Amino acid sequence: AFRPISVFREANEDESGFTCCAFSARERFLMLGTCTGQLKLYNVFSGQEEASYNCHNSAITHLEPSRDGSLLLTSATWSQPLSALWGMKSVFDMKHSFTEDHYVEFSKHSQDRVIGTKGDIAHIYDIQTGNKLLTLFNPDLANNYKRNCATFNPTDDLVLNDGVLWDVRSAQAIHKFDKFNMNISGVFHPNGLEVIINTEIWDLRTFHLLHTVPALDQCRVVFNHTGTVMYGAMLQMKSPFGSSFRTFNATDYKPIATIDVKRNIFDLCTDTKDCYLAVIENQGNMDTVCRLYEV
Numbered sequence: 001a002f003r004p005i006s007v008f009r010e011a012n013e014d015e016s017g018f019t020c021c022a023f024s025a026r027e028r029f030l031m032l033g034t035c036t037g038q039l040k041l042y043n044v045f046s047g048q049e050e051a052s053y054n055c056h057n058s059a060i061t062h063l064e065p066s067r068d069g070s071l072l073l074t075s076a077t078w079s080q081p082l083s084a085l086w087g088m089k090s091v092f093d094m095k096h097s098f099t100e101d102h103y104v105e106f107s108k109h110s111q112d113r114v115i116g117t118k119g120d121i122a123h124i125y126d127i128q129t130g131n132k133l134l135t136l137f138n139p140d141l142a143n144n145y146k147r148n149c150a151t152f153n154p155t156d157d158l159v160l161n162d163g164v165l166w167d168v169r170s171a172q173a174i175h176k177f178d179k180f181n182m183n184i185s186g187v188f189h190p191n192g193l194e195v196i197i198n199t200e201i202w203d204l205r206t207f208h209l210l211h212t213v214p215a216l217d218q219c220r221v222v223f224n225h226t227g228t229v230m231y232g233a234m235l236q237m238k239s240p241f242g243s244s245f246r247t248f249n250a251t252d253y254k255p256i257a258t259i260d261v262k263r264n265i266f267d268l269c270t271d272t273k274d275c276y277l278a279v280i281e282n283q284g285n286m287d288t289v290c291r292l293y294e295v
């Protein structure tokens, strides 16, 4: 089951403004973005704030720490810059910013690059210099996914942007996947063999359709660290998700559990050891709690 372990809200605040979360390198410490553009570091078990940092002048939508715990990507709503890279080492300082990119991820095998999305366009930046290396967009192959998010594959040699597979080295589109929905652009399976674009599961080798999984419709998807479980929550208030998330066996895409928290979800994340699941849920207008579950 998902046994509730603990709950906490943003300390002191009349209205709790948690918008997103990620587990840090440090065990029992969660990072949370707020609707006022702050990064908070919380003890997940005590529910006590340890540290607060000013990142953006608008709501944090999404964040991602680097595996080495040295770097953090943030994205905001109406700020400029919209996304940024932060040093989490000595002083908490902005390394680089990414202009109009509303979503950013690290590269996967080696975290030496950032991939940002602006609408249908993907930008690849170098972490050290912060120089835009590549702009990926082909007007001939675009799907114009409303909620497009560009992503590297596990080995960083491919990118999926707007349902288009790109060879990173040659910067050539090598395959466009057919469009079946208006919103969701898809992710790589951590096994490196499959891409998941909404309900469709494509083989990377043959580009054949392996499965249809209707339950994934309009879902953002995140895998547990071992790549054994896939979490999905249907997109929709400022609330990006409805009231439920679903788990699937990542090996065979069979359903496991449907969890309905009866409250709108802003975000979820699992820790490095996949013991715990953190969910940001609205109680109400904006009064979010972080709920911690034992997986």
Ligand SMILES: NC(=O)C[C@H](NC(=O)c1c[nH]nc1-c1ccccc1F)c1cccc(Cl)c1
Pocket (backbone or CB within 6 Å): 019, 020, 061, 062, 063, 103, 147, 149, 220, 221, 222, 231, 232, 233, 240, 241, 245, 265, 266, 267, 268, 269
């Ligand atoms: N940290 C993660 O990548 C987790 C991921 N978060 C988002 O996708 C998310 C949280 N706010 N806005 C978003 C979001 C919404 C739409 C498009 C891109 C986005 F990043 C997720 C995946 C599966 C279920 C859920 Cl409940 C969340």
